[PDB]
């Protein structure tokens, strides 16, 4: 796998993804230690398989209390870290896949305040330049599921409105005269 070859590493990751559902925690950990090295790989097809492997690991190692053997914990931590790093992937399609994986209702709540609370867990010292943009996107994507979202922001058009004349020469007028 360490050898630089796109097709070879791709079929290696395929073999790993196919043999993963029948591996032991220690074996899975010592086999995932080199798998996470594809986060900085130029090929956009090997990173996809690595992210598939990591999403499978995340979905099949959610249990934090049960199945506690000090190996599943580290595997889950590493998988979560690399999945978080995958939020700034160069490929827009792969980044969209990763953000749709994270934006699911199982991993991020649908309530606004609950999602704001949970977004702090998606932080890592790796994604710091883009953390604010990702958080704002995750917060604003919940607006589409709102009744007022497709409605117009203002009822009447300018064709039937009143032109507001600021006739009151209040303290604002002194500043407007001082300005120009």
């Amino acid at each position: 796998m360490r050898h630089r070859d796109d097709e070879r590493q791709k079929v290696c990751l395929d073999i790993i993804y196919k043999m993963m559902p029948k591996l032991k925690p220690v074996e899975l950990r010592e086999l995932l230690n080199p798998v996470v090295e594809f986060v900085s790989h130029p090929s956009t097809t090997c990173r996809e398989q690595m992210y598939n492997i990591l999403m499978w690991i995340h979905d099949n190692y959610r249990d934090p209390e049960s199945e506690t053997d000090n190996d599943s914990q580290e595997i889950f931590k590493l998988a979560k870290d690399v999945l978080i790093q995958g939020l700034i992937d160069e490929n827009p399609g792969l980044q969209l896949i990763i953000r749709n994986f994270w934006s699911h209702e199982t991993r991020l709540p649908s309530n606004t305040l609950d999602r704001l609370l949970a977004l702090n867990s998606l932080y890592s010292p790796k994604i710091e330049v883009h953390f604010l943009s990702l958080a704002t996107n995750f917060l604003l994507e919940m607006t589409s599921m709102s009744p007022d979202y497709p409605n117009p922001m203002f009822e009447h058009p300018l064709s039937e409105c009143e032109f507001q004349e600021y006739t009151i020469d209040s303290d604002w007028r002194f500043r407007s005269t001082v300005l120009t």
């Binding site: 630089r4 070859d5 796109d6 097709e7 070879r8 791709k10 130029p42 090929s43 097809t45």
Partner: protein, 406 residues
């Protein structure tokens, strides 16, 4: 020429296009094409004596190269030791030692070169990485991205070294026209000449033995006339080329060769002994396809130039130009790159410093920290004798005391 010593730095047990001095100990021989500058030592008496004393050493080449090589009577002793390999077919070669039973497997891939009948590339893959040997190739700009076997999943493979052809690796040969343009020009000229009378003939002063078959075949297909050559039995198994050549001297287009053909043409006589048919004199024009002559011009020139009343020159190169070489090497982006041949004008250092910015050497490092110890002054030469008046100035500041111990 070929400045290659027929020995890669990664795989010294195999020799390519050179069998002269140290290649007599090699375990496998490779032949790019059938040019004489790439066949030094192939007919040596020492190599002849070695072949009859070994059984596991072979000569790998293209099938067309094998056909062109076995035709010559001087090289027919290789008939039982040549193994032809198809292009674009990754095969495994066994580098078994003769004396000891040691063995070593390597994967070679033959890629087309577009130079002459049988010219191919060699792409080796073994324990010491991937190396590429493009011996006398010809690629236009934007064609390196179309080689299937040089790509692994849509990206260029990791190549460790490239022994590329640097025949025209100099700013003199900036952009040589494609061979189709020269072909069209020569076709138009020969048509406009021979279309007048059946006694107008056209000579083709071709210096190289192989490489001009494209011109011959296309002229024959576009004019219906058959080119005359000295020998054509070498193409007996190549129907698409054999049916365009003829040994008869009663044809208009000629491409025969002779060491003293220049004086013969000056006397209005082709290299073949015939000078006139039916006692009617022949009107001969000479077209010499070459490239080195165009690389010395001082102003704007054309593909088909006229250097005399019955003399012409054509820009027909089977070697990649400077821009094409730069594009190819920049697209491959290898770790190293070694020039196989040095140009006549250029030298080794200039070709090396031209090829170096194209190699994948994008790794810099800060200089090593030079330590500074044992300062260059031992005794305090700047010490005072401490004689003062002590009354013009205020009292000295008392030495501080710090008892904090963290």
């Amino acid at each position: 020429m070929s400045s290659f010593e027929g020995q890669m730095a990664e795989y010294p047990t195999i020799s390519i296009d050179r069998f002269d001095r140290e290649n007599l100990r090699a375990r496998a021989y490779f032949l790019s094409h059938c040019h004489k500058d790439h066949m030094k030592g192939l007919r040596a008496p020492t190599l002849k004596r070695r072949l009859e004393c070994s059984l596991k050493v072979y000569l790998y080449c293209s099938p067309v190269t094998k056909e062109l090589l076995l035709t010559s009577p001087k090289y027919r002793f290789w008939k039982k030791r040549i193994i032809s390999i198809e292009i674009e077919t990754p095969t495994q070669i066994s580098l078994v030692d003769e004396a000891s039973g040691e063995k070593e497997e390597i994967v070679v891939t033959l890629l087309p070169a577009g130079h002459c009948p049988g010219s191919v590339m060699f792409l080796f893959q073994g324990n010491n990485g991937t190396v590429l040997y493009t011996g006398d190739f010809r690629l236009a700009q934007g064609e390196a991205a179309r080689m299937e076997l040089l790509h692994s999943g849509g990206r260029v493979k990791d190549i460790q070294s490239v022994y590329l052809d640097t025949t025209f690796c100099d700013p003199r040969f900036y952009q040589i026209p494609s061979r189709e343009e020269c072909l069209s020009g020569v076709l138009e000229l020969v048509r406009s000449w021979i279309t007048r009378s059946p006694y107008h003939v056209v000579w083709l002063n071709c210096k190289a033995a192989y490489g001009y078959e494209y011109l011959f075949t296309n002229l024959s297909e576009e004019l219906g006339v058959q080119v005359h050559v000295n020998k054509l039995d070498m193409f007996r198994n190549m129907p698409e080329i054999l049916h365009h050549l003829t040994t008869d001297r009663n044809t208009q287009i000629h491409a025969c060769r002779h060491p003293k053909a220049e004086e013969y043409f000056q006397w209005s006589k082709l290299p073949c002994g015939i000078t006139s048919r039916n006692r009617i004199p022949l009107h001969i024009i000479s077209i010499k396809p070459s490239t080195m002559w165009f690389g010395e011009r001082s102003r704007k020139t054309n593909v088909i130039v006229r250097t005399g009343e019955s003399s012409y020159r054509a820009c027909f190169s089977f070697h990649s130009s400077y821009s094409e070489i730069k594009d190819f090497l920049s697209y491959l982006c290898p770790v190293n790159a070694y020039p196989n041949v040095i140009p006549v004008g250029t030298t080794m250092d200039k070709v090396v410093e031209i090829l170096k910015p194209l190699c994948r050497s994008s790794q810099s490092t800060e200089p090593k920290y030079k330590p500074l110890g044992k300062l260059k002054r031992a005794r305090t030469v700047h010490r005072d004798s401490e004689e003062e008046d002590d009354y013009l100035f205020d009292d000295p500041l008392p030495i501080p005391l710090r008892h904090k111990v963290p």
